[PDB]
Amino acid sequence: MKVWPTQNMKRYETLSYLPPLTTDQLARQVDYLLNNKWVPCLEFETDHGFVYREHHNSPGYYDGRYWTMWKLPMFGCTDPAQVLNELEECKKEYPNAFIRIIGFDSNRQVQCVSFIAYKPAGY
Amino acid sequence: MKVWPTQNMKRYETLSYLPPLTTDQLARQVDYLLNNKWVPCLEFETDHGFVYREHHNSPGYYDGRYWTMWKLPMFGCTDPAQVLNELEECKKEYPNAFIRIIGFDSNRQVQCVSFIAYKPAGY
Amino acid sequence: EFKAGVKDYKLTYYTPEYETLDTDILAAFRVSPQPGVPPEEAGAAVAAESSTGTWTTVWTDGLTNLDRYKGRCYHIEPVAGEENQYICYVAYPLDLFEEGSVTNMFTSIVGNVFGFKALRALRLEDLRIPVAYVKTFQGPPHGIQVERDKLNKYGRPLLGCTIKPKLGLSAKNYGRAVYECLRGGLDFTKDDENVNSQPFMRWRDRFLFCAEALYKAQAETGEIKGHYLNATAGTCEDMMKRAVFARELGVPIVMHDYLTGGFTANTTLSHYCRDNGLLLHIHRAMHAVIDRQKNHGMHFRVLAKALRLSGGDHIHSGTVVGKLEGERDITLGFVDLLRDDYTEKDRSRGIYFTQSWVSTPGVLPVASGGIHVWHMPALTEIFGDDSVLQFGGGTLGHPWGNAPGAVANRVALEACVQARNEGRDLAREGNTIIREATKWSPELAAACEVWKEIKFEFPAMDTV
Amino acid sequence: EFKAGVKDYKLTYYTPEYETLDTDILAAFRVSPQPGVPPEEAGAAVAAESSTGTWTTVWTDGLTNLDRYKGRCYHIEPVAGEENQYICYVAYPLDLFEEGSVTNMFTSIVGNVFGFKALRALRLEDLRIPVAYVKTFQGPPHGIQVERDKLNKYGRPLLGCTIKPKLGLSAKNYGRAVYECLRGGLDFTKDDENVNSQPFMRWRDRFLFCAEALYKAQAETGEIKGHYLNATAGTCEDMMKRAVFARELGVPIVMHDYLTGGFTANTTLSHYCRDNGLLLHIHRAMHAVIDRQKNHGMHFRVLAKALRLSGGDHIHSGTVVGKLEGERDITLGFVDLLRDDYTEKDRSRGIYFTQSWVSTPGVLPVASGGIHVWHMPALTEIFGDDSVLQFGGGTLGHPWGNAPGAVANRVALEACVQARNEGRDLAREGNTIIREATKWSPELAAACEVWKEIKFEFPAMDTV
Amino acid sequence: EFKAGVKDYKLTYYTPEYETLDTDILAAFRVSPQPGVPPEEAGAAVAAESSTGTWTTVWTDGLTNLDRYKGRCYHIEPVAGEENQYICYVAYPLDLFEEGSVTNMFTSIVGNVFGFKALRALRLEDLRIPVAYVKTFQGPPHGIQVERDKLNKYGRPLLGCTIKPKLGLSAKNYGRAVYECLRGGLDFTKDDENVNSQPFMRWRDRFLFCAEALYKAQAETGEIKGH
Amino acid sequence: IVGNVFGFKALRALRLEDLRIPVAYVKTFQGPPHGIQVERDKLNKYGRPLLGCTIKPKLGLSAKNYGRAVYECLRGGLDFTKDDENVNSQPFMRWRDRFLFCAEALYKAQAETGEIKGH
Amino acid sequence: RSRGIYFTQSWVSTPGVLPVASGGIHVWHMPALTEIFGDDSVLQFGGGTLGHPWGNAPGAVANRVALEACVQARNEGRDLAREGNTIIREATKWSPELAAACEVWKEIKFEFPAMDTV
Numbered sequence A, B: 001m002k003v004w005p006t007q008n009m010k011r012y013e014t015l016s017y018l019p020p021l022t023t024d025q026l027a028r029q030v031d032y033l034l035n036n037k038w039v040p041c042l043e044f045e046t047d048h049g050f051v052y053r054e055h056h057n058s059p060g061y062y063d064g065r066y067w068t069m070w071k072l073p074m075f076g077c078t079d080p081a082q083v084l085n086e087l088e089e090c091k092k093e094y095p096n097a098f099i100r101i102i103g104f105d106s107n108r109q110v111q112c113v114s115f116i117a118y119k120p121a122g123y
Numbered sequence C, D: 001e002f003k004a005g006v007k008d009y010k011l012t013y014y015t016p017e018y019e020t021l022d023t024d025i026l027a028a029f030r031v032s033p034q035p036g037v038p039p040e041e042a043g044a045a046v047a048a049e050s051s052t053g054t055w056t057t058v059w060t061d062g063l064t065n066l067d068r069y070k071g072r073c074y075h076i077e078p079v080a081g082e083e084n085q086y087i088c089y090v091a092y093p094l095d096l097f098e099e100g101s102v103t104n105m106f107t108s109i110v111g112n113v114f115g116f117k118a119l120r121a122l123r124l125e126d127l128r129i130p131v132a133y134v135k136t137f138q139g140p141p142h143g144i145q146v147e148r149d150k151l152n153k154y155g156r157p158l159l160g161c162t163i164k165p166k167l168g169l170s171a172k173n174y175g176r177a178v179y180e181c182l183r184g185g186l187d188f189t190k191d192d193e194n195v196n197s198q199p200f201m202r203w204r205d206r207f208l209f210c211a212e213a214l215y216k217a218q219a220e221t222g223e224i225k226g227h228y229l230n231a232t233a234g235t236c237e238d239m240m241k242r243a244v245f246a247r248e249l250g251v252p253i254v255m256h257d258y259l260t261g262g263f264t265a266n267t268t269l270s271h272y273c274r275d276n277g278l279l280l281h282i283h284r285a286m287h288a289v290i291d292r293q294k295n296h297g298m299h300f301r302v303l304a305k306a307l308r309l310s311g312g313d314h315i316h317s318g319t320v321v322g323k324l325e326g327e328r329d330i331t332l333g334f335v336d337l338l339r340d341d342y343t344e345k346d347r348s349r350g351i352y353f354t355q356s357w358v359s360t361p362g363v364l365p366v367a368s369g370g371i372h373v374w375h376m377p378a379l380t381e382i383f384g385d386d387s388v389l390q391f392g393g394g395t396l397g398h399p400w401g402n403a404p405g406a407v408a409n410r411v412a413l414e415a416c417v418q419a420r421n422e423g424r425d426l427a428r429e430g431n432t433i434i435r436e437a438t439k440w441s442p443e444l445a446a447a448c449e450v451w452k453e454i455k456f457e458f459p460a461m462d463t464v
Numbered sequence E: 001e002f003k004a005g006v007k008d009y010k011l012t013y014y015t016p017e018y019e020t021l022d023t024d025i026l027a028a029f030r031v032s033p034q035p036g037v038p039p040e041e042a043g044a045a046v047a048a049e050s051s052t053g054t055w056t057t058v059w060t061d062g063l064t065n066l067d068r069y070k071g072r073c074y075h076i077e078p079v080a081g082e083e084n085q086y087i088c089y090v091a092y093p094l095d096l097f098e099e100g101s102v103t104n105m106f107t108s109i110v111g112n113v114f115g116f117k118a119l120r121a122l123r124l125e126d127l128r129i130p131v132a133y134v135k136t137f138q139g140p141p142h143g144i145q146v147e148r149d150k151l152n153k154y155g156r157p158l159l160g161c162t163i164k165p166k167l168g169l170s171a172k173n174y175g176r177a178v179y180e181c182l183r184g185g186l187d188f189t190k191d192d193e194n195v196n197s198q199p200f201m202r203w204r205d206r207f208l209f210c211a212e213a214l215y216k217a218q219a220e221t222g223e224i225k226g227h
Numbered sequence F: 001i002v003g004n005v006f007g008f009k010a011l012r013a014l015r016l017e018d019l020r021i022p023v024a025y026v027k028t029f030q031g032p033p034h035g036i037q038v039e040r041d042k043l044n045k046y047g048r049p050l051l052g053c054t055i056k057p058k059l060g061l062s063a064k065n066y067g068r069a070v071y072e073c074l075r076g077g078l079d080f081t082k083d084d085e086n087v088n089s090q091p092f093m094r095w096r097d098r099f100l101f102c103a104e105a106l107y108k109a110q111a112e113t114g115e116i117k118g119h
Numbered sequence G: 001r002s003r004g005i006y007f008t009q010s011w012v013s014t015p016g017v018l019p020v021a022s023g024g025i026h027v028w029h030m031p032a033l034t035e036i037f038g039d040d041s042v043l044q045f046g047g048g049t050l051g052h053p054w055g056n057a058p059g060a061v062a063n064r065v066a067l068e069a070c071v072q073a074r075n076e077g078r079d080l081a082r083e084g085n086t087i088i089r090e091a092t093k094w095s096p097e098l099a100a101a102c103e104v105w106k107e108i109k110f111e112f113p114a115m116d117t118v
């Protein structure tokens, strides 16, 4: 009978309970988002990697949901290599940030994909 | 396509997005204030260099707007050297503080000039 | 001439030449007449007594224009496979209904006709709600898009869990179970539908302890958490009192049993949730009393459309593979009616009319009841990303406790999502996908071992 | 040992040696199991999933005392005349229910069990509500005694009438019809169940015009009059808004569709009526969707007891002889459950448990639907003085208009009351009694002529 | 693809092949373009700036489906005998409007387009309000039928009268004038549009005296009166 | 002043160019809730014009995307952002959701830049 | 009368209102706008910000930089009406965000005959 750890067990939503994604698994997730014609976009955060409540406490309000946009959503992108390239660029400029890859469905206007692609040192 | 930085990018209102003011550029701003017959005054702050909200959160309330006055407003001042002189004096006594120069219009009772003239090391 | 006396209903209420208007409410009734009653008269009786007529001629009909207000049976179709059973289509003018009131809509359409002596049985299969009427309702307080945006959750079905035993736990033990469940990877936990306020646990004490647990789990995991606090009560005042405290606690979601509580009270809560930013989970307790049998009652798709109008962010939809009944095709049918903006007529899925929603937000379907880790591939394949999968006994029944039970479900789910995204067939490779994950997840391995042989396979009553 | 895994429900939920407590809620379920499912397991499943258990073993059961909280199937009886059908009796501890909430009571007892795959059909026949639980409810706002005392009406059934056409009349024409009906001898008139607020007639305009007509008829006749103003609405707020205006007008009675509106909203209105002196007429719209079939649903007697607890001064009970279904013995059974303080178990009338009400006021049964003057003797004989007989089409369908139509019904009724009081047999002499009255009452003679051959005779679905 | 820069409005907002939906709000604009501005461009600019677009291309358009939200000029016809004047028909999706708010409806349709430099003049001639939008409004508190039924007046036009002088009369003299008017056969009398509450006559005093006067006139004539 | 006179048949056209409002009447009004001086003092902004920006497209964006656009605009140096005039409450974006997300956005931008922000 | 003011107007200390300049303006208009309105005004750039090739943040930077460059030049005594273009171009040398914006809208002007004339 194993006891689930309580220390340094922060999670990052979708896919974070699986083993770390290898280079090929990451590429497959990007291909999935492109084959569904969703628009890829990168987001990064250096200060608050997890939600908190500083400015308000009402229902549905949380701080830390918005991260910073890396350049612009890659409209018209059809090559997964282009997305992977920006990831490397972002990592180089922000090695100390959490980097997230998202995919927009412009018809429903909902993000159909979202997962951490990079975590800084100590996470 | 460049991404606007998120780290250590604090700003100080009017003129803070321009390259650092040179000695003469600073003097010309003081000349501008004096030529318009506004009265100069210096303010400094050592701990809360930026606004925050500790004591209240209602509309229009923020802490950190008020700084400490350096001596008194220079009523009847007509020599820019006099102003730049007090600035050096203030820096000598408070090298660890932010120092800003403001200009009062007594008729409208509105500050028509306000810019950071000195920042502590690291900023 | 006002001629006193009884006339057949079909003389005025059976109009096979009628062309429906885009503002009419259309109804598809499964009618089983008594021997000797013609289908035209049976269909006309239903149309008449659910709109403007009664059993004998009244002079007051002449004071108004009945042609403009009467319900009309405009089409009759024999049902194949059954004896003396027909599908009768009835059209109702837009003017007959009160704006924004599901209560009024049902009072007319299913008010008294199901008890007519002239009928053996009657069932309402579907309703075509015109867009002009749809716009008079608020609809879900938030809807799928907004909910995902508020909770910051994307790319996978959401995970929930009902606390057990149903009744009998104290307020503190409830929060204790909630904390352990949420810290393991579940997004939500919830009050059982019958957990309101009782001697063993009063509502305010429960709300208070669950919020403490909920916030502790959120801090520990870094993921936003919620616990459906049940606002279902005996009066409007009590229901509001509970919703108000939830608002004070700053929690994200509350729940309501819309059928046992009632449409009037549900609409009130729906509006309150919209004005106060609270997500609203809807439980369909009692629905099977009404929609189980093929020959009599109201099909769930009708109760589902009614909820989307009155208002709810989630609603249980069945599991197909669980302990409660639910056919696959029929379920997929009303799931589309709950999430999409447009659904075309499709008799193979029990959809009698094309339904449009003019941007009324979609509702998240909730699969719950007797499901476990081995059902994960099938659930993911059937419902897709926009759904909530709940495991009550499937979490609290894990040999190592709540946290490990939650981990097993979260891992099983993500393994399926990853496999699907990579192009694998969940229907064909489901079992192997779960097995592969048990190799690195002892929590999942322990769960698979316990429920390996458990399935629920019985003949269905509700069939198209 | 907490042993993870699935066990049969009967191991914990079938206790044939259990002796019920006087504080337990007892339920009689008509159970039809799927082939291969033993009645003991089917009965245990129902008891379990409607009280404390789920489909697999959970460790949390050990934190509490399940023996003290679990629902129990304590008796099983085969149903004669049916195949693979049993009556299963279940006992529920008093602690499982929220005080004063019918909503909570039903959520547990009929919440999820009707959809179990392991069952083909399920029907709740009766409930034994312990006096300890009965005392937590307000009950009728007034009740039979108080109502008769407020209206100053004694010695005969009360007379009502639904305005027709159901929908389509303007506010002014509604009041016009109301005035003519009341001045002829009827005690009440009423909004049809689906008349709430619509384009052709908004509620406030209706309330206003009906009060004018109502007061004019009272002044003209010298007898106290009333018109059931429908408060049924889409939200609690709207419902209250309508009840409030009725209070302002000073009128005696309002009505509510308790099933389409919902128990939560109904209980709110019931309490308001008690605090403001308003009589509350309850319409059972939608009940047949639930109680028509013998094999599945909930019998009306259960819905009737629920209303007496939540609160209502009147409630429709059926006519037996009218256009809507209703068997004589079964009807007399739940009429006693609605009016008396004590009713003993009687299987010949579908009464499974002895029910005591510890002085909760009685509710006036309302006979309505497809009845006319020739049915008067039978109605009077079946229901007795404490009832309300309503004639909608039976009044507005009279060849001479509303007033003469009202006179015909009032005369027919009093003729029966007089004959009964003198010792005549209404069952045997009914027809002759009506004929004798037509000799001096041309209004009645005209009515008898029109509906002489009209009867409603069809085979009943709901049989003991 | 996001390409920064200005494009003609007609490339996105002029859709002559569009067939209107029964849920669309339709508008008929009388457009007078500046010399040199094609009617297609003028019509497209009105549709664009009264619905979803602005003067230059923005990347945010790609986050949503502009095809289901954009307003569109679907037809243009010349005005007879008028120089450089056209009637441009524009369709607006139902989703652009707030339920039950005329304020919101006008804010979009006539908010900023009347001031465009590219136009000499603009006039909104008509609007087709779809039934799905009409149902989101309460409409008249009562309406013709109910009003006649409340007042018990049928078979003829009703008669009213505005009290004069417009301003300057005291509260008591106002009621005096009202009683005399109503007792002679008029169904109604009324405050002039600019009579609200002023130094020469405060509103509560007026209401009070007019009530006394109208009830006296009603009792005298036996016909229901109003002010 | 402009109630009925613009429709007189005896006139071809009419336009009100100006109005001299006497001080005695001006004193019966509250006027601006705050005004130029007080606004600059509350926001701590002096010596330059203030900078704003209307979010686009006018209509069609969801509440979350609206707040996303707002944060990015404000963090770049703008003092304010704003709802387009026709953005009230609609199917694609209800008002309370927009208010909530825009608040999160503007507070993030303010903390990042150190300058007071508004939407 | 040369500005359409028919009457002398007094406000007895009623607070002033901030004028807001908005609608189809971009960085090249900054000098003119600063010259016409002065410090007490609000200049708004919708398309002028969300239309920047690099996104919102860079679009905002371009406008804030353009504005402060005009304020500094004015305070030093330079003529915004005569040196406007030069002042903007000087700033494009150290601000790549502004440079990118200037490139996109350099030819865009709105010049049409006015209906509302004195």
Ligand SMILES: O=C(O)[C@@](O)(COP(=O)(O)O)[C@H](O)[C@H](O)COP(=O)(O)O
Pocket: C162, C164, C192, C193, C284, C285, C316, C317, C318, C324, C366, C367, C368, C369, C370, C371, C390, C391, C392, C393, C394, D049, D054, D055, D112, D115
């Ligand atoms: O009471 C119960 O049985 C549950 O909490 C599930 O428990 P488990 O997770 O332990 O099975 C749910 O309410 C049912 O799923 C409702 O049925 P449906 O979803 O059909 O409305």
Ligand SMILES: O=C(O)[C@@](O)(COP(=O)(O)O)[C@H](O)[C@H](O)COP(=O)(O)O
Pocket: C049, C054, C055, C112, C115, D162, D164, D192, D193, D284, D285, D316, D317, D318, D324, D366, D367, D368, D369, D370, D371, D390, D391, D392, D393, D394
């Ligand atoms: O709508 C109707 O049909 C009625 O107004 C009767 O009209 P008539 O008097 O013209 O028949 C009543 O609501 C029914 O009696 C209700 O059924 P029950 O009493 O069974 O609940």
Ligand SMILES: O=C(O)[C@@](O)(COP(=O)(O)O)[C@H](O)[C@H](O)COP(=O)(O)O
Pocket: E049, E054, E055, E112, E115, F054, F056, F084, F085, G020, G021, G022, G023, G024, G025, G044, G045, G046, G047, G048
């Ligand atoms: O809807 C628009 O067009 C704007 O948001 C500007 O957008 P851009 O910044 O994209 O041009 C403004 O409301 C107008 O400036 C109003 O006109 P005015 O100021 O004349 O009242």
Ligand SMILES: [Mg+2]
Pocket: C162, C192, C193, C194
């Ligand atoms: Mg449950």
Ligand SMILES: [Mg+2]
Pocket: D162, D192, D193, D194
């Ligand atoms: Mg009725």
Ligand SMILES: [Mg+2]
Pocket: E162, E192, E193, E194
């Ligand atoms: Mg006038």
Ligand SMILES: [Mg+2]
Pocket: F054, F084, F085, F086
């Ligand atoms: Mg605008």
